[PDB]
Amino acid sequence: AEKPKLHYFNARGRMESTRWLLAAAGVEFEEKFIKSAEDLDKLRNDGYLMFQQVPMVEIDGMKLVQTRAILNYIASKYNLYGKDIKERALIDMYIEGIADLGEMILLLPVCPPEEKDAKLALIKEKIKNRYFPAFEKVLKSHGQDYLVGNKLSRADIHLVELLYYVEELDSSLISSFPLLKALKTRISNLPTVKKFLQPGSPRKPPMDEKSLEEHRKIF
């Protein structure tokens, strides 16, 4: 069984949700870090990046780019995409909500600093009034441990990844959402996930002022 190989910077960025999903599924993978503009040029010139961009994942004979394509493939392969078309529709709707909020956060430290504090408050309010209530409502309507089909899926994993990111941003945001808190604890305790949250795993740290400025300089 040939191990998936992830090509990305040694950073969270657009590769983290893939690290989470693979690791939640107990799937062992290798990372090949891109450290120089030469490292990227080499992947490009080898014809390995369909749109000249990373992330790229080598898996089951394919050089897969585009985050959503990579994630969809992994989730079907490891039975984390529900069990039929309608379950997939619910999963997709949830993760796309997650992706909207998460995209706003991914792209917050690269925004204009005079309207960056306007952007931070906008997020915070969407979280409290838009997204966290939407997921709390799903959990409450099923009363089950999982968002869809009463079974672990990518939606649970990605929601919990998101709750970790929202906690780094402000710890009080989840405080009035008891069902989200319990989901985070439950998923964090699954064996694969617990292992991923432990030190020494492929899970990556947040980008700080140092690692961001250096990245832009060399690429």
Ligand X SMILES: N[C@@H](CCC(=O)N[C@@H](CS)C(=O)NCC(=O)O)C(=O)O
* Plot region of 13 (φ>0 → left; ψ -120 to 50 → alpha; else → beta): left
Rounded CA gap, 1 and 56, in Å? 19
37: CB partners within 8 A, 6+ apart: 218, 219
Q: Binding site for glutathione, residues?
A: 8, 44, 53-54, 66-67
Torsion, Cα 209 212 215 219, to 10 degrees, reads: -130
Q: How far is the CB of 201 from a second copy (least distance, A)?
A: 26
Residues that contact ligand X, how many (by CB under 6 A): 11
Q: Which of residues 120-159 bind Cl ion (CB under 5 A)?
A: 154, 158
Does residue 5 touch a second copy according to CB under 8 A?
Answer: no
Choosing among a second copy, K ion, Cl ion, none, which partner's interface includes residue 80 (Cβ < 5 to 8 Å by kind)? none
Contact map string, positions 6 to 45, toward ligand X, x by CB under 6 A: -------xx-------------------------------
Contact map string, positions 77 to 106, toward ligand X, x by CB under 6 A: -------------------x---x------
| Part of the chain binding a second copy (CB under 8 A), chosen from 27-35, 84-92, 165-173, 207-215 | 84-92
Strand segments (E) across the chain:
5-8, 30-33, 56-59, 62-65
Does residue 108 touch a second copy according to CB under 8 A?
Answer: no
Q: How far is the CB of 1 from ligand X (least distance, A)?
A: 25
30 versus 115: smaller Cβ distance to a second copy? 115
Q: What is the DSSP string of 14-57?
A: GGHHHHHHHHHTT---EEEE--SHHHHHHHHHTT--TTS-S-EE
Torsion, Cα 146 152 158 162, to 10 degrees, reads: 40
* 77: number of Cβ within 10 Å: 15
CB 192 within 8 A of CB 152: no
| Part of the chain binding a second copy (CB under 8 A), chosen from 5-13, 49-57, 189-197, 203-211 | 49-57
Report the interface residues with ligand X, using CB under 6 A: 13-14, 52-55, 65-67, 96, 100
